[PDB]
């Protein structure tokens, strides 16, 4: 029974028309907020006079 019985082709469409979209590609943005704290003081006392 030595014979070729079937085949498969590595065929693709030429997308002159937008038949397929493929993968999507979109823009995103993230926000990070960093408020600045105030720290405890250090003091140098002086005589007012």
């Amino acid at each position: 029974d030595l014979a070729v019985i079937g085949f498969e082709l590595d065929t693709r469409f030429t997308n002159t028309n937008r038949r397929q979209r493929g993968h999507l590609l979109q823009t995103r943005a993230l926000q990070f907020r960093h408020p600045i704290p105030m720290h405890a003081p250090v003091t140098l006392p002086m005589d007012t006079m």
Binding site: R33, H34, P35, M38
Partner: protein, 37 residues
Amino acid sequence: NYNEKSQRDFRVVTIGYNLAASRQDEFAERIYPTTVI
């Protein structure tokens, strides 16, 4: 408001994202040199 310390009017800095990559990477280019057809 005895203490008026900035809470919302922060500096906004935009991080860049656009890139102009060079066709296939230098790794692929050294292996598969590009010929313009």
